[PDB]
Design a protein around this ligand. Sequence first.
Ligand SMILES: Nc1ncnc2c1ncn2[C@@H]1O[C@H](COP(=O)(O)OP(=O)(O)O)[C@@H](O)[C@H]1O
Ligand code: ALF
Ligand SMILES: [Mg+2]
Ligand SMILES: [Zn+2]
Ligand SMILES: [Zn+2]
Ligand SMILES: [Zn+2]
Length: 756
Amino acid sequence: NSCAYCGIDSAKCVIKCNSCKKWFCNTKNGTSSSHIVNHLVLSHHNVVSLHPDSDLGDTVLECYNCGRKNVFLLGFVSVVLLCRIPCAQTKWDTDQWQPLIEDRQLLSWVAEQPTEEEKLKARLITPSQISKLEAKWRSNKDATIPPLLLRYQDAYEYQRSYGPLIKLEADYDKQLKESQEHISVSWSLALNNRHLASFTKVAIGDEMILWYSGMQHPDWEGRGYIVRLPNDTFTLELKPSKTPPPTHLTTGFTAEFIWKGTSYDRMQDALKKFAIDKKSISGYLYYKILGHQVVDISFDVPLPKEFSIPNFAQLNSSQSNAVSHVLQRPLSLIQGPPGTGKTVTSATIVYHLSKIHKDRILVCAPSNVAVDHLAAKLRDLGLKVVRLTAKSREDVESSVSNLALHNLVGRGAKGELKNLLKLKDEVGELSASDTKRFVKLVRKTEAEILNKADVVCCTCVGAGDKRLDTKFRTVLIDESTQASEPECLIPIVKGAKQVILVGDHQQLGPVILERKAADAGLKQSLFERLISLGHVPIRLEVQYRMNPYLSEFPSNMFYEGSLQNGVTIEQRTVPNSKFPWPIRGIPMMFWANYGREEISANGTSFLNRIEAMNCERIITKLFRDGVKPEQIGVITPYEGQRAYILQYMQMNGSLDKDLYIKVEVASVDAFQGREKDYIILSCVRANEQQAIGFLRDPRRLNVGLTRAKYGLVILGNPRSLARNTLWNHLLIHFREKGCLVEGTLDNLQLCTVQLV
RNA sequence: UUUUUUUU
Ligand SMILES: Nc1ncnc2c1ncn2[C@@H]1O[C@H](COP(=O)(O)OP(=O)(O)O)[C@@H](O)[C@H]1O
Ligand code: ALF
Ligand SMILES: [Mg+2]
Ligand SMILES: [Zn+2]
Ligand SMILES: [Zn+2]
Ligand SMILES: [Zn+2]
């Protein structure tokens, strides 16, 4: 009954985690969070109960209303425990709701701090000891490489360099994002004659393992795939096994989502292909990637009279010369600050390569939304685009769903396949014989569609999909600077002859969880290495996206003031606006909010209720000013804030709820390459320690400031952001303009925080 | 760090 970390034993201090049955105290000791919070965050556990002798007795904390038991959701209204959402928005006194977890530790009346005397039971413990102890419990419940080179002799040395780095990341991801009760199962038989288990971050097809250990039956394990998801029941279709399923058992089952390292697996396969598949890549590109010296090549290619496409953007001379130069090179690097038309230029290039060679082109980006964006532009130019989406996201809403391979299969299909599709939709099921027949026909149809496409669009990793068992001679990777080198390698090692890489090293880099891998240089993109090796990139420096006032800070802070404006204040102003900008003629403002951050539902992210609230007020205000939902974008660094802002407006939106769902809400990272007329930036971070996490990255702020065309509102807490040098420069820049404000939207005042 | 990627 003592804290499994340090040994504190006070009945008023310890908390039981219901999952593993271990006890933890509520003290911050060698840990940024209290020990109980630290355990929940790392282990992904949610449910806790107080000590019997505590001031509240043996009680499992749960919501009075719906009865959920995730502490990261729980708060109290005065007392009554209620979920953050939806229970705390529904109308005792909702407006005074406060979370049980405050400043990364439970409230004192839920779990006290130890007296000095009680603290004596606490053994000296380092952060290291605590960290390794959690890692150890992953398996057992117990107690307390050649460096990246400038030049590679050959592909095998290349592989032995990046390979172990990939594995490090993979192992750390698995240990970090793996998942984890008392499940009641109802059994049935699927038409295909497989066993179905129904019970109780998920998608149909996901592999799971179901197992039982207890006093009703010998140990049993079973693997299967998700075939139905909560509208309230989940349904897992089990694989055929030698040992029959215990269909007579109902309770005491455990289920576990199986971690897939698919992304890392495909990076390794690309590395191996590069070393081993002789048709995987051209000679020029091969040695280029190796870091060798190669004589520059030109393609014998007929140029068009005009590079710009009618009824679309008219390229400036730099963009035009760029497309002219690229059409004849095996390798091209397009570089430039935000909004310089890198993507429009790329779309033009793809368009022209298509007409000249009439040959399939592979188009990629690290993120899904960047892929969609580019696919849309290409479709607008009248190209036959096929968007290959991950199996995981086939049910995800998209702006280019009509281009998705799976939707193309359904549409414009006939005969036996048409029958099997209608049958599967109306019945919801297929027999064994019809399933094998269905799979054969779909593959045949998929191949035929992919083969006749002018362009195939997918994420870099998605390029490693098995459906793409064919050669792609020309590859364009947009936002390539967001990808690690092996990730970029995936689409390039498919018989590539001509490659175009677009990027900006001042915008977001790849996410490397493992610090040793990042230290070893896994953060360096292919785009960057090729440049540091002497490859001269085409540079674009005239920006066409945003009002000149919005480009000022980013230009001076990240691009040595080299970023020019191609559009004017008059081109980026709204003659009839009545939106309460602080200063006439300047469409930006930093609205200081003095809320505090909260830990999100999955225990690993953040949200900010006050910032979310004022976000709804900004949007509603814009609505009143006649600004349309499609013209507004909300970006935030944290997935926790993204989820909350979305749900919150669906409950508290002043106007028609349907208006608010059409307002895009995304993460900063996810939104790179995209733009909106109006942007709301929610910074989220606000705590006593003035810690701001990965907001320290200049490249994340850069992206956050460069999404808007007409207007930008920044919501944030200066008290904590100001400790950071970069953010301090931003606040000061806004203060100098008269745009740093506080108070209520309808009566904004100059911010009073003291900036030095 | 908490963000991108991904499932017969
Ligand atoms: N030559 C041009 N004339 C008019 N608008 C342009 C021109 N070049 C780019 N734009 C536009 O300015 C914005 C940014 O283009 P984009 O390709 O997304 O920039 P980047 O990819 O470098 O971030 C878009 O709204 C786009 O259509
Ligand atoms: F560089 Al961008 F949208 F691709 F600002
Ligand atoms: Mg772009
Ligand atoms: Zn402790
Ligand atoms: Zn636990
Ligand atoms: Zn609830």
